[PDB]
Design a protein around this ligand. Sequence first.
Ligand SMILES: CCCCCCCCCCCCCCCCCC(=O)OC[C@H](COP(=O)([O-])OCC(O)COP(=O)([O-])OC[C@@H](COC(=O)CCCCCCCCCCCCCCCCC)OC(=O)CCCCCCCCCCCCCCCCC)OC(=O)CCCCCCCCCCCCCCCCC
Ligand SMILES: CCCCCCCCCCCCCCCCCC(=O)OC[C@H](COP(=O)([O-])OCC[N+](C)(C)C)OC(=O)CCCCCCCCCCCCCCCCC
Ligand SMILES: CCCCCCCCCCCCCCCCCC(=O)OC[C@H](COP(=O)([O-])OCC[N+](C)(C)C)OC(=O)CCCCCCCCCCCCCCCCC
Ligand SMILES: Nc1ncnc2c1ncn2[C@@H]1O[C@H](COP(=O)(O)OP(=O)(O)OP(=O)(O)O)[C@@H](O)[C@H]1O
Ligand SMILES: [Mg+2]
Lengths: 256, 108, 74, 96, 231
Amino acid sequence: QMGFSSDNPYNKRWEYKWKHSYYTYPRDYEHTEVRKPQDSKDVPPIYFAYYKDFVDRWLPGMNMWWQRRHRIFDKFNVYFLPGMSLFFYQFADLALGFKIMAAFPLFLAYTRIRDKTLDPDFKETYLRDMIYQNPEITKYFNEETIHVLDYEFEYLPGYLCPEKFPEYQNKTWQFFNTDTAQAEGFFKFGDVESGATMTLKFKTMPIPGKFRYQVGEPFYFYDLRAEIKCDGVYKEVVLVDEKESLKKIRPFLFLI
Amino acid sequence: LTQYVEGQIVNRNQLTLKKQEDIEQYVLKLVRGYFRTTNKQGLNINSVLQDHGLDEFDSIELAMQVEEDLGYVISAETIPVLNKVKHFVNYINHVEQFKAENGKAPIA
Amino acid sequence: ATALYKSSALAGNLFLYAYNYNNFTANIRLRTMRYLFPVVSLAIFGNIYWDYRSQLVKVNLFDEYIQARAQELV
Amino acid sequence: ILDYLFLLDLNDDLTRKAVFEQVIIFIFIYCTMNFLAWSTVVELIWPTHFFNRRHSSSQEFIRFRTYTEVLLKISAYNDFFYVLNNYYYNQKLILK
Amino acid sequence: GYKIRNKSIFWTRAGWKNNWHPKNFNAPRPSYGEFTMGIRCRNDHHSFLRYVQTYRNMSRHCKQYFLGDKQLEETFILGLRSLFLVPYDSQCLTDQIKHGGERRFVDQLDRDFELISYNTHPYQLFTYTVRNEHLAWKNEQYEKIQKGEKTFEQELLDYLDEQVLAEKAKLRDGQNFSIERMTEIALHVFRKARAGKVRPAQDVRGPDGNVNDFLEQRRPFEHPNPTGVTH
Ligand SMILES: CCCCCCCCCCCCCCCCCC(=O)OC[C@H](COP(=O)([O-])OCC(O)COP(=O)([O-])OC[C@@H](COC(=O)CCCCCCCCCCCCCCCCC)OC(=O)CCCCCCCCCCCCCCCCC)OC(=O)CCCCCCCCCCCCCCCCC
Ligand SMILES: CCCCCCCCCCCCCCCCCC(=O)OC[C@H](COP(=O)([O-])OCC[N+](C)(C)C)OC(=O)CCCCCCCCCCCCCCCCC
Ligand SMILES: CCCCCCCCCCCCCCCCCC(=O)OC[C@H](COP(=O)([O-])OCC[N+](C)(C)C)OC(=O)CCCCCCCCCCCCCCCCC
Ligand SMILES: Nc1ncnc2c1ncn2[C@@H]1O[C@H](COP(=O)(O)OP(=O)(O)OP(=O)(O)O)[C@@H](O)[C@H]1O
Ligand SMILES: [Mg+2]
C-alpha cells in the first residue's frame, strides 16, 4: 500500500518519487475534467501556501508513519534508546557531552523510524528485465503496449512461521525488530495489443551478497508467479519458485 | 457535471458501453472528431494514429477526452502506449473487466 | 508629532498595498508580502501605540504626585 | 498581556541594548542596494530578448512558431488580412 | 543588408555553436560500483511520465477559462505543442545537455504550470485579451449583417473583384494574371483604405483626398498639450 497519498487523484504510485520544481503548490489539485471558472476559487485565501505544504507534504508524511507504526515498536526503540537519553539528560547541565549522548539516541531512532516507514521500493527495472526475458510473457506482453491496472506492495507484519523461516526466532534479532522486513504484493498488467491480462504475484526478502556485513539486495524475489489470461487462454508461468530459491539463499535479518 | 459550450453551460453526459461493438464505434467517432486527424474515413480498427497526423501529444488530448465522456481517471503511465485504435478498445475493455471483478477503478 | 507621523507612514503602506492590491493578491511571487504585511503592520502599530500609551501613563503619574506632594508641604 | 510584548518598546530601549536603532539603518541600506542591483539584472533581459527574436533567424534553419505567434495569426488578424485570403481564394480557387 | 563579418562568432571552447555542454573545469566523470560507498544524486528516470502529465495538466487547467470555445481550444493546443516540441526540433542537441536535458525542460514546464493553475500566466492573460478583441470585431460584423448592412470587409472584396475584371479585360496580349499582379492591386487599395480610417472619405475625392487637412492645424481649446509647453 502507498503510505504517502494526498488528495491528488493521478499517479498514486509516483507521488513520493516525483520531485516537482514548483516554488509552491498549485492552486487546485490536478483536474480530472474541464471545469468552470466559478468551480475554482480565484485569489486563494491568505496563508494558502502554508496550508498546502501541511496537507500535501506534512500530513501525508505523518500518515505514512501511522500506517506503518507496527514496524518501529521494538524493544530497542521503545525502551533502550529513550532510557539511554534519560540517563544522560539528568546530567545535561554538568557538561556538553551529556547533552550530545542524550540526543544521539533520539536522532538514531528517527533514522530507523524514517527508513522503516518508507514505502518498500524494489528495483523495478530488474523486474521488467526479468519478465521480458521470458518467452511465455513476451508472447502476450511488451513494454510498448503494456499498462498497469493495480499495484500493491507492503511489508508483512510480525514474525513468520517458525518452520519455513527459523532465522527470525533469534532473541537478539527480535530485540531490534518486531517485523520480518519481507513484503508481498502483486502487479495487475494489461496488453493493449494482444488484449491479455495477468496478475504478477511476488514475494521478496532481503538477502546477503558477496560480502560479510552489508546486504546485497533488500528485496530479492524468491517467489515470482504470473497468472496470464487472454481471449480464451489461461496460462500460469513460474519465473521463480520459493521451494528452489529458499534452499540456496536465506534472509538477512537486518539489525539497526 | 456541467461544462461551458460556446459560452453556454451544458450538463455533461457520461456513457456506459459494456459491449465490444459500442466501443469500436465510440473510438472511431472520437478519433474522427479530433481536428488533427487526417483521412477520417480511412480510419479503421487497425489504423496507426501516426498514419493520420497524430503524435504522442495528440494521444493525450484523446485520452483526456475519454475521461470526459466515460469518467475514467487514466494514469500518465498508460497514455503513452495508446498509439492505435485497437489499443483504446482493449484498454477500455480491461477497465470494464477490472471494475467488474475487483469492484473498484484501476490505480491512477 | 512623532506618533502622528508614524501613523501616517503606516497608513502610507496600506495605500501602497491598496494601490497595488491586484498584484499582492493574485501574483504568487508576492505571496510573502500578502501573508506577512499585516504582521509587520501590527508590530508597527504596537510600537506606535505602546510608546503613546506608556508616555500617557507617565504623564499621569507625574501629575498626580506633584499635586499630592504639594499639599503635604503646604 | 504577556511580557513578550515588551519588545515593542522603544522609549526605554537604551536601558537594555540600544542596538535596534542602529541595525535597521543597515537593513534599509541593504534593501536599497539589492533593489538597485536586482532590478538591473531582471530588467536588462529585454535587450537580449528583443534582438534575438528579430535578428537570430537564418535561411538554413527552420523558424518555429511560438504560442504568441499562433494566437496572433489566428485570433488577432486584421480586416485587410481576412480580405486578402478570401481575395486569393475566390479568384484562383473559385473563379480561376 | 548587413551580415556578421566575424567568422569566429559562433565559436565556443566546447565547439561551434555549442549551447548544450559548455566547457567547464568540473567535468562529469564516471562512477564505479566496487569503489563507490555512497552517492547523493537527484537524477531519476521519471522525466518521461512527468512530461506527459505536465501536458495533460497545462491543457486541462487552461480549458477552464475558454468557455467551451472550440476554435480556441484547438488554437491553444497548437500553441501548447509548439512549447513542448522545442527540445525535439531545436538546433541545440538536447540529448547532449550537461546534466540531462530531459529533467531540465520538465522542471521548466513545471514552473509554467504552477502559474497556470493560478490563472496568472502571461500566455493566459494574453489569450483572453486577444480573444475578446477578436470577438468584439466579429460581433460588430454580425450586428451589421443582421441589419442587412454591408461590412467593410465585403465592400473591399467586391471592389477588388471588379478591379480584376477591369484589369484583365485589357490584358489580352497575355493571359497570365499572376498572383503578383493580383497582390499589388490589393495593396494599392489597402494603402488608400488604411489612410481612410484616420481621414475618412467626405466627398467624391475619396479617402484622405483633402489637401486642407494637411494645412496648419492647432490643438482644440478643450484638449491642449497636457504633457509639455506649447510656446
Ligand atoms: C512643491 C510643494 C510641495 C508640496 C508637498 C505635497 C506634494 C504633493 C503630494 C502628492 C502625494 C499625496 C497625494 C495627495 C492627494 C493629491 C490628489 C491626487 O492624488 O492627485 C490627483 C489624482 C489624479 O492623479 P493625476 O496626476 O491627475 O493622474 C494620475 C493618472 O491618471 C494615473 O492614475 P493613478 O490613480 O494610478 O495615480 C495615482 C496618483 C494619485 O493617487 C491617489 O489616489 C491619491 C490618494 C493618495 C492617498 C495618500 C495616502 C492617504 C491614505 C488615506 C488617509 C486618510 C486619513 C483620514 C481617514 C478618515 C476616515 C477614517 O499618484 C499617487 O498615488 C500619489 C501617492 C503619493 C505617494 C504616497 C506614498 C505613501 C508612502 C510614504 C509615506 C510617507 C509619509 C507621508 C504619508 C502621508 C499619508 C497620509 O486624483 C485622484 O487620484 C482621484 C482619486 C479619486 C478616488 C480616491 C478614493 C480615495 C483613495 C484613498 C486610498 C485609500 C488607501 C487605503 C486606506 C488608507 C487609510 C488607512
Ligand atoms: C511534547 C511535544 C512534542 C515534541 C514537539 C515536536 C514538534 C515536531 C514538529 C515541528 C518540527 C518540524 C520540523 C520539520 C523539518 C523537516 C520538514 C518536514 O516536516 O518534512 C516532512 C516530510 C515530508 O516529506 P519529504 O520532505 O521527506 O519529501 C517529500 C517528497 N515530495 C516532495 C515528493 C512530496 O515528511 C517527514 O519528514 C515524515 C513526517 C515527520 C512528521 C514531523 C513531526 C510531526 C509531529 C506530529 C505530532 C505533533 C503533535 C503536536 C500537535 C498537537 C496539536 C497542536
Ligand atoms: C529542550 C531542547 C531539547 C529538545 C529535544 C531534542 C531536540 C533535538 C534538536 C532539535 C532541533 C530542532 C531545530 C532544527 C530543525 C531540524 C533541522 C533539520 O535539518 O532536520 C531535517 C530532518 C531531515 O532528516 P532526513 O533524514 O529525513 O533527511 C536529511 C538527509 N540529509 C541529512 C542527507 C540531508 O528532519 C528532522 O527534523 C529530523 C530531526 C529529528 C529530531 C527529533 C528528535 C526526537 C526523535 C523522535 C522521537 C523518538 C522517540 C522514541 C520513539 C520510539 C519508537 C516510537
Ligand atoms: N547509478 C546511479 N548513479 C548515480 N545516482 C544513482 C544511481 N542509481 C541511483 N541513484 C540515485 O539513488 C536513487 C534511488 O535509486 P533506485 O534504483 O532505488 O530508484 P527506483 O525508482 O526505485 O528504480 P526502479 O524503478 O528500478 O525500482 C535514485 O533516485 C538516484 O538519485
Ligand atoms: Mg523502485
